[PDB]
Amino acid sequence: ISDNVRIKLYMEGTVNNHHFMCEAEGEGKPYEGTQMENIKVTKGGPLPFSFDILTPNCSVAITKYTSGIPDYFKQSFPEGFTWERTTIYEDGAYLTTQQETKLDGNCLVYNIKILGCNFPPNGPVMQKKTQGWEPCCEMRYTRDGVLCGQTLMALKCADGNHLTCHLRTTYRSKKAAKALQMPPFHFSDHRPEIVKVSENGTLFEQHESSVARYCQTCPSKLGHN
Amino acid sequence: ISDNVRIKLYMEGTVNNHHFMCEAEGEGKPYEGTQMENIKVTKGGPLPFSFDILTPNCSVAITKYTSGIPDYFKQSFPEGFTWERTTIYEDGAYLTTQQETKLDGNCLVYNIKILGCNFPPNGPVMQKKTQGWEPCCEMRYTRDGVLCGQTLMALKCADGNHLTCHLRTTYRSKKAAKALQMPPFHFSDHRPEIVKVSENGTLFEQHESSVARYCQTCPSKLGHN
Amino acid sequence: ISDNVRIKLYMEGTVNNHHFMCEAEGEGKPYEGTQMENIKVTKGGPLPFSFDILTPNCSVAITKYTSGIPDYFKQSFPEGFTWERTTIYEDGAYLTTQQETKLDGNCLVYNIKILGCNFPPNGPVMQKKTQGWEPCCEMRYTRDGVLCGQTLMALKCADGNHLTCHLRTTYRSKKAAKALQMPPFHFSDHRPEIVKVSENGTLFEQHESSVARYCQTCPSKLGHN
Amino acid sequence: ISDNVRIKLYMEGTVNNHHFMCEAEGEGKPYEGTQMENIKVTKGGPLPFSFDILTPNCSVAITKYTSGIPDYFKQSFPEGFTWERTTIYEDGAYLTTQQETKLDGNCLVYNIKILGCNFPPNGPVMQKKTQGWEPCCEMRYTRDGVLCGQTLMALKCADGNHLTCHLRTTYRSKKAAKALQMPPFHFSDHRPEIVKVSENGTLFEQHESSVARYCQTCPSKLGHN
Amino acid sequence: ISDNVRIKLYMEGTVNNHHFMCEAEGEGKPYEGTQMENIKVTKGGPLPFSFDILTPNCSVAITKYTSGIPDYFKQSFPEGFTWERTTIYEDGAYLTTQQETKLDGNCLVYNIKILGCNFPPNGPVMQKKTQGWEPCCEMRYTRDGVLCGQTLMALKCADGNHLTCHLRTTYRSKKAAKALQMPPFHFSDHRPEIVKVSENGTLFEQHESSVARYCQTCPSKLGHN
Amino acid sequence: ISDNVRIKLYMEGTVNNHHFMCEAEGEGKPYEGTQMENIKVTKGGPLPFSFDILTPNCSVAITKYTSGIPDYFKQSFPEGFTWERTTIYEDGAYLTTQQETKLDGNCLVYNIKILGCNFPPNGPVMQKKTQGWEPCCEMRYTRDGVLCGQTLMALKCADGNHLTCHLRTTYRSKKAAKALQMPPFHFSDHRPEIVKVSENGTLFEQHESSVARYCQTCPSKLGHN
């Protein structure tokens, strides 16, 4: 994959019985870990819920992998990969995702399927009273030949409070595991941001910065990474 | 709704990145709480996983509502209703469902969407070692003007062990609240069974019996139901 | 055990940094499945939270075991048994319990240790908005030589809502597995009730009826329990 | 609190019906974020389970707080503070903790109470097949006047796997909120390590390094921390 | 006024900065002192506080006036009347009401305006911990050519406690003073009750029964009524 | 307590800087709720103010307790009880009372201390332009293990007016919580009357009838008391 790539995204889902579709065009810098997308709600807009719950579903090939840690995602191309996940919100809501990532020439294509349920109608998400995500840190480890990840995230609320959730993910390379160099346990910092909302809340300018690393703030007395 | 109806079912989903589709035809006696369906895997079958995880997705209009407990599901016709649910398995797997129920005269139609993830490859489900569900008891209560339900279920394994999961559901009537009498807290027993498997593991004959009731085994010292 | 026993209970715990102690005297009919206790908050009372969260920690030997289902608990005497559990509330609260049960003559003795945390200060429990529990249905099955249980319960709120929770329990007989007839999968209905409160909310007259059984409301089409 | 303090620790608990007690003696550098402890199992040892599950219970006052982020723990002295927590393991085990921290002169004193349950007998913890914790990242945010924290952790297993768990903590200062400089959302890296084991597996030399910080690796288009 | 009248009600208010509006249709028997209303929260519902604080603002023409005591309210028709009041809660909350009562054909029409303030957020009202009002007794006496009333009321709380308040009212007939027979000092017993709640806590079936009288339980030694 | 008792009263107080003392001999029928007293102003009389403000301070053990409502006062004997109260008049006057009640054989002994302030000099009380109390209804309810009471009273005024006041009382039994049966919410009707004044307005023959009950005039469409 090159240093610069364009992004094409297609999304479809149903949350609390509300069907919607999204489409996006953007660009990314795979080795710099930076991405930008202009995401449009093509159907079912304006959504009866905060767009924030959709953001984290829109990036794992665009991450700056440091310290010589093998890159499970960039190694997967041209074949590409898929990933599956369930996000559990502290107030009882569940959002499950299935995504396919492929590289068509120099354009990264994301195909997303979503099913969400039990979001409280008076909660901050359904009342559209959230104000974006705080940055987060994902824990990544191998299991059964695939790469897994778990993340704790926190949504900023109008009240000043934070609505927390838990993501449990399984990343699946379309390439036979044997043809890959599996990584050791590591982390990935992520900072999702929505810097612009327009067209009556149906078009969002979203950005992302992410870096894969080891724990670099706390030295190891046993000589481990 | 008629005391004698036919059933038509359409199901599509992806579990652990495996896409599939199913269809079925059946019969049911809404007031008797009994139903039978012949479910065929029309695409992606034989499935690489146990069909058991799909069974509970296939009937809450077909339930014997006793003790004068208002029947939220039958009261919803002709408009119909939808329900959403996430099933959490003890071994980390998640399965989310979105379902729409409509009545075309004497035929109930079920449109089901599913997304499953994180099922362990060597687990009983992906290994096809499960042997059907044990009967279960669902807890039902009102919240936010709709009907909620929670169920604990157990899959029988060759081991002699049981694989447990937790179902958290929200039932949404398409009828106006003004025309619906909401029920008090109550239970519903369910006994889902696959009485026959044919067509090289692609045709499943499922039966269902369910009864909504109060707790009748333990007397109340306060005179409550 | 006799058909009429005396009961003595000792309880100590800390919930949200609040230390407390309880003691009770009561009686029960082991084979009838009925029990009653006069529980007194001997220290830390009146409690800064609803006594309802403590009730369910107060009696698995006092249950009417029907249908010839082996009684794991009554079988445990004279040796006795212990049990451990964690109750997970839907609003983030956790309550863990360790209990020891002994039979001295015809007096059952209960020793209970509790640690509870994260109960939201404005939640139904800390605000004392509850009105007792709804009856419940426990799911019981063996695993690794011991008896497991899982129950979903619901607390009634003045508001008309219900606060739900999930109990995950492991029962441990002091008899060896070889000296016991392990039971198959079965259920246990439970109906806890507080019929009187006095002494400025420090003395509670608690009652309970329980029955172990198979699912008989829904007929098996394969001859299973 | 000074740059160099003494550490005394007392712990008691019961896990899977096994009672035990521990005591420790060590030192720490509150502003350097480094702690050294010699923990001895005084009763019930060698423990029938891996000491690893006990480690994380042994020191939030010994963390290097950076970036002007107000330090909730050091601001609580001399009055001190307590914290409560429940750890949920992926294989169904739960461990609940209650701890009090006081500063007696120039010596921090830890009093810990623990109740754990449902650890599978053949799992890596009860089988003593775990080999220490991976470094972790805690998410910290305020709520209801106290400080909350959530962490995902991974225990290294001898078979190459990682046993994951989720920590949910509430930190309670003994000072009135109006006397504290409440912190914004932030992170805390933690690196626990056992550098030596002796005395027939009853004496463990444990060390920890921790840093409180904002996300430092990801640029922000909005200029946010 | 007829022996059977219809009731139409319009209400608008703001309590602790939360705006709302209600409408109701009902029936009443003026001389029997009984009436019923189905009150709907048309705007701002579900309310973030107990509906109980609204109930008392919804009857003074529908009261059984006994012992020949002149009826200030029924004598006011067809002109009608208005009444003003401030309710002072023991925990610092205040709720002021302005009401207009008109007789349109067979329909008594109530136009209510309300402003509430200083209700503690953790009090029983804002926390919805109440379970309806206890019956009450209103003291009635003339002053400055109009009829005054004062009432002490008590809201039942989930924990067995009562939250008390003080009502101070001025009833103002629209009829010419020369056309009214003013009453002597007397009392009025009132029993407000909510017998049903539906439509996600926005529709309430409310009932009331009242009787105006002298003190009949305690005989006068001086022959007074 | 006997069905017929003698009474001895001692009262001392200061109202608007005027000191005074009273003493009385009387009798009563505790279960009949009737009592009489010949109260003599022994010091500071004739009083510079209406004797009416003193009357309500002179008898809760003498009240006919009906409907099986537990009698907190008669239950208190032989130990006895005390009560404290503050009466708030609408024109800014305050009168606080502390009273002790003891049963010496067949003689009830009342010890009363009073402090009154801010009575307007041109008001009906200081001007002696009052014509006795109207009967009243006291609201009684438990709180913190004791019995509380609130009453609204109306003093007949010169030009056909009524001077209103609010009594807030706490009754304290000398018995411990374990030896008392606390009553539910209830009312107490009271009818104080001065039937004779003599010896230059220094000797008053005072009478009273009282009855404890539930609201019996208004039907309950729920079954409550």
Added chain:
Amino acid sequence: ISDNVRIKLYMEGTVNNHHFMCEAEGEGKPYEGTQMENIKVTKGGPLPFSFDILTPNCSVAITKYTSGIPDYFKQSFPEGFTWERTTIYEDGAYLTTQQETKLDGNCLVYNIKILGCNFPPNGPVMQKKTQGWEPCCEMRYTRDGVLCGQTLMALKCADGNHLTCHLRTTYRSKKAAKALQMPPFHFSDHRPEIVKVSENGTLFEQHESSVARYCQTCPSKLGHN
């Protein structure tokens, strides 16, 4: 907010069954703590009661906050704030207010709702015998995340007397608590004055000066402000 702003006011209310509306245009120097307004009675004028009771309801953003005391009102912009209050008069009258404050450019807009009752017809207010307010001192302190205030005020009467009242206020910022610097206990002096009355008592030129401060006249022996 600018150092010089325009003011626009809208007021509506009902006092003693008399409806009225007012509108005003004016200016203010927010940091100097001074403002002027020409208030017009647009409906219901001339008022059958002294305009003095309306004055205090007409601007807490216009106050000179000294000594470094955080300014809760100015910090609230651009979001703005609202406030609620009930004024209790010594002669039994009550007046409740609900106000919304917003800033549009450099124009502060006030929207006020009022309900008043029980004002005696022969009292100084209804007789229009008041001659403006004496200056006052408000007590300000935080509670439950918001700012509270209590003030004692006194109306000068033509006869040399003063009519006193008690104001109880809750100020509510529209910003999240965490985004505000909450103040310590403090005071605010206020000097309201009507300098001109014209157009037959329907147009009033109103002025005010206010300063927030600590107790500056009495030195602290303990070093407190």
Added chain:
Amino acid sequence: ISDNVRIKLYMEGTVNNHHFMCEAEGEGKPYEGTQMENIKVTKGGPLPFSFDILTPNCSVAITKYTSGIPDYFKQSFPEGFTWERTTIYEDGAYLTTQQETKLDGNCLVYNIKILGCNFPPNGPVMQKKTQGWEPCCEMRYTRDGVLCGQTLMALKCADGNHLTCHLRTTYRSKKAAKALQMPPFHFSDHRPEIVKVSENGTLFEQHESSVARYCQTCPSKLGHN
């Protein structure tokens, strides 16, 4: 009165049925407005409630009267004066006081009588959780030949909150109003402080500073004080 006087104090009271007596010795500078006292609980100590509620009953001749405001208290000597007051706390407690002040040579003598009631057992006063008073501002005005006063005060609580109360006072000179120059409306700042506690919490070194003035922070447009 001289500029340096000795102070002697005698106090007796009953609060929530607890009897007590206190005696104090100290000094005061009448014109400087400062006094200090060593107050001893001579009977019934240590008190079961915070000593803070007694502090305000212990000084109005010791105040710096500025601005030419006639000093009602100093003008009263040698005859002296008395004052009476009721303190209304927000949580329902009431404390009434009667005091006599005389000048014996160069020694001011205070005789205080107190009756307090209804203090909540779990409130900060009975729980000894208050930490002194915040300074305050009393409103003073003449009425019916005497001097009245009203003050709002705030007790600092351990948790950081404030417990407020309202004082209503009447000051009565022993001289006839004829020989006195009555003051215009004015204020008096007061700063009570406890600087030392000893002898098992029965001895308190109390201090106070007070100044009588007009509003000096807000200039009058019209020309009033």
